[PDB]
PDB file of all heavy atoms in Angstrom:
ATOM      1  N   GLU B  12       0.329 -11.015 -14.058  1.00 83.14           N
ATOM      2  CA  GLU B  12      -0.878 -11.149 -15.006  1.00 83.14           C
ATOM      3  C   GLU B  12      -1.968 -10.342 -14.436  1.00 83.14           C
ATOM      4  O   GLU B  12      -2.703 -10.563 -13.571  1.00 83.14           O
ATOM      5  CB  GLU B  12      -1.297 -12.662 -15.099  1.00 83.14           C
ATOM      6  CG  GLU B  12      -0.137 -13.644 -15.623  1.00 83.14           C
ATOM      7  CD  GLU B  12       0.306 -13.246 -17.013  1.00 83.14           C
ATOM      8  OE1 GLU B  12      -0.337 -12.610 -17.821  1.00 83.14           O
ATOM      9  OE2 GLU B  12       1.496 -13.681 -17.345  1.00 83.14           O
ATOM     10  N   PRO B  13      -2.227  -9.074 -15.131  1.00 85.49           N
ATOM     11  CA  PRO B  13      -3.086  -8.110 -14.750  1.00 85.49           C
ATOM     12  C   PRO B  13      -4.537  -8.536 -14.876  1.00 85.49           C
ATOM     13  O   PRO B  13      -4.985  -8.860 -15.936  1.00 85.49           O
ATOM     14  CB  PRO B  13      -2.882  -6.894 -15.680  1.00 85.49           C
ATOM     15  CG  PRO B  13      -2.373  -7.590 -16.899  1.00 85.49           C
ATOM     16  CD  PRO B  13      -1.687  -8.792 -16.612  1.00 85.49           C
ATOM     17  N   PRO B  14      -5.240  -8.426 -13.689  1.00 81.94           N
ATOM     18  CA  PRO B  14      -6.707  -9.060 -13.741  1.00 81.94           C
ATOM     19  C   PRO B  14      -7.630  -8.396 -14.697  1.00 81.94           C
ATOM     20  O   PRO B  14      -7.343  -7.292 -15.184  1.00 81.94           O
ATOM     21  CB  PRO B  14      -7.165  -8.662 -12.284  1.00 81.94           C
ATOM     22  CG  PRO B  14      -6.277  -7.439 -11.862  1.00 81.94           C
ATOM     23  CD  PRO B  14      -4.982  -7.703 -12.531  1.00 81.94           C
ATOM     24  N   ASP B  15      -8.661  -9.161 -15.068  1.00 81.71           N
ATOM     25  CA  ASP B  15      -9.559  -8.720 -16.069  1.00 81.71           C
ATOM     26  C   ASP B  15     -10.478  -7.641 -15.431  1.00 81.71           C
ATOM     27  O   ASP B  15     -11.122  -7.915 -14.414  1.00 81.71           O
ATOM     28  CB  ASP B  15     -10.335  -9.800 -16.634  1.00 81.71           C
ATOM     29  CG  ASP B  15     -11.049  -9.474 -17.979  1.00 81.71           C
ATOM     30  OD1 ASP B  15     -11.624  -8.420 -18.040  1.00 81.71           O
ATOM     31  OD2 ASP B  15     -10.889 -10.327 -18.983  1.00 81.71           O
ATOM     32  N   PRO B  16     -10.553  -6.414 -15.952  1.00 81.11           N
ATOM     33  CA  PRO B  16     -11.393  -5.346 -15.577  1.00 81.11           C
ATOM     34  C   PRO B  16     -12.921  -5.923 -15.259  1.00 81.11           C
ATOM     35  O   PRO B  16     -13.427  -5.521 -14.222  1.00 81.11           O
ATOM     36  CB  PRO B  16     -11.468  -4.456 -16.748  1.00 81.11           C
ATOM     37  CG  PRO B  16     -10.197  -4.592 -17.413  1.00 81.11           C
ATOM     38  CD  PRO B  16      -9.618  -5.984 -17.061  1.00 81.11           C
ATOM     39  N   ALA B  17     -13.349  -6.733 -16.142  1.00 77.47           N
ATOM     40  CA  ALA B  17     -14.676  -7.229 -16.005  1.00 77.47           C
ATOM     41  C   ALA B  17     -14.937  -8.275 -14.894  1.00 77.47           C
ATOM     42  O   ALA B  17     -15.938  -8.551 -14.470  1.00 77.47           O
ATOM     43  CB  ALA B  17     -15.195  -7.806 -17.366  1.00 77.47           C
ATOM     44  N   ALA B  18     -13.800  -8.961 -14.489  1.00 76.02           N
ATOM     45  CA  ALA B  18     -13.830  -9.975 -13.426  1.00 76.02           C
ATOM     46  C   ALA B  18     -13.531  -9.467 -12.051  1.00 76.02           C
ATOM     47  O   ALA B  18     -14.237  -9.852 -11.086  1.00 76.02           O
ATOM     48  CB  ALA B  18     -12.972 -11.113 -13.794  1.00 76.02           C
ATOM     49  N   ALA B  19     -12.525  -8.574 -11.928  1.00 75.64           N
ATOM     50  CA  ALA B  19     -11.894  -8.223 -10.633  1.00 75.64           C
ATOM     51  C   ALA B  19     -13.007  -7.729  -9.552  1.00 75.64           C
ATOM     52  O   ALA B  19     -14.055  -7.183  -9.910  1.00 75.64           O
ATOM     53  CB  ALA B  19     -10.938  -7.117 -10.819  1.00 75.64           C
ATOM     54  N   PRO B  20     -12.680  -8.067  -8.296  1.00 73.12           N
ATOM     55  CA  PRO B  20     -13.601  -7.639  -7.178  1.00 73.12           C
ATOM     56  C   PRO B  20     -13.776  -6.183  -7.148  1.00 73.12           C
ATOM     57  O   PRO B  20     -14.743  -5.573  -6.552  1.00 73.12           O
ATOM     58  CB  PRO B  20     -12.853  -8.114  -5.937  1.00 73.12           C
ATOM     59  CG  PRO B  20     -12.036  -9.278  -6.460  1.00 73.12           C
ATOM     60  CD  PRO B  20     -11.599  -8.854  -7.760  1.00 73.12           C
ATOM     61  N   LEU B  21     -12.848  -5.265  -7.618  1.00 72.92           N
ATOM     62  CA  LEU B  21     -12.967  -3.845  -7.728  1.00 72.92           C
ATOM     63  C   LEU B  21     -12.236  -3.188  -8.845  1.00 72.92           C
ATOM     64  O   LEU B  21     -11.112  -3.565  -9.188  1.00 72.92           O
ATOM     65  CB  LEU B  21     -12.441  -3.306  -6.394  1.00 72.92           C
ATOM     66  CG  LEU B  21     -12.440  -1.725  -6.293  1.00 72.92           C
ATOM     67  CD1 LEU B  21     -13.905  -1.209  -6.496  1.00 72.92           C
ATOM     68  CD2 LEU B  21     -11.895  -1.325  -4.868  1.00 72.92           C
TER      69      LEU B  21
END
Side-chain angles (χ1 to χ4, degrees):
Chain B
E12 302 299 334
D15 198 312
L21 180 55

